[PDB]
Amino acid sequence: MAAAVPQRAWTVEQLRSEQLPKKDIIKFLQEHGSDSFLAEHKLLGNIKNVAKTANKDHLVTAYNHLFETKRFKGTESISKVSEQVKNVKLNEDKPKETKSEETLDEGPPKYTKSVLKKGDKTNFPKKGDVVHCWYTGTLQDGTVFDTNIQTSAKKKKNAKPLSFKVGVGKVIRGWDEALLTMSKGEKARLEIEPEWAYGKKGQPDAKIPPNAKLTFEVELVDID
Numbered sequence: 001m002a003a004a005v006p007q008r009a010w011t012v013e014q015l016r017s018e019q020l021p022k023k024d025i026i027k028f029l030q031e032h033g034s035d036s037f038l039a040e041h042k043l044l045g046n047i048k049n050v051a052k053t054a055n056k057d058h059l060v061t062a063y064n065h066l067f068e069t070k071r072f073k074g075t076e077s078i079s080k081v082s083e084q085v086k087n088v089k090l091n092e093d094k095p096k097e098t099k100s101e102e103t104l105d106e107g108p109p110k111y112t113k114s115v116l117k118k119g120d121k122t123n124f125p126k127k128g129d130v131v132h133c134w135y136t137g138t139l140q141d142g143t144v145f146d147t148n149i150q151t152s153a154k155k156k157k158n159a160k161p162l163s164f165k166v167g168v169g170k171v172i173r174g175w176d177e178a179l180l181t182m183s184k185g186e187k188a189r190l191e192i193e194p195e196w197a198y199g200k201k202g203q204p205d206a207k208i209p210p211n212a213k214l215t216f217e218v219e220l221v222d223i224d
Helices: 022-032 035-041 047-053 056-068 173-179
Strands: 115-117 132-138 144-147 187-192 214-222
Touching (some): 022 056, 173 187
């Protein structure tokens, strides 16, 4: 399993624009949305064939609400090699494993980060300096625990990124280590373990059970 809440990759001004290829916007919703979701706007199927049925605003309108309706792509096939059930033993609850077995030799921290869309790659957050970005959290099963992705301002002035100083015990130790490597105008998807978030106990406050992996995506907007 691997598909947390993806952050906005494009902008309303870009999509609707006449410089961005609709071919992509269609492939993005297909990899970030579920069949049913796409079916609604007839976005599922064949892009080449959908690019004729789906209009410019059609692709953008479906890319905007997708986040508002939080109806991203869900489990359908995922990874599956086999299924075994031991008789009287009790061991593991989830399929686990992932075929490949080699992430590092020394041992990575208690989290995983992946830069989706590279940004400035120069203006990094310094200790003591504030930062403004968005973030959408979702449990292993995709349970939203914290979504700062407010509505767009173009439709109504009511959106303001969260401003917090880095390296000042503002956020979790796992997010601080990941965000600290974020660049101005960049999108990423990092998953922090329960050891560097809430703990083995969990977070009953947000219906978060013990040992729950938290994956999300952030988008840096500015750094002061």
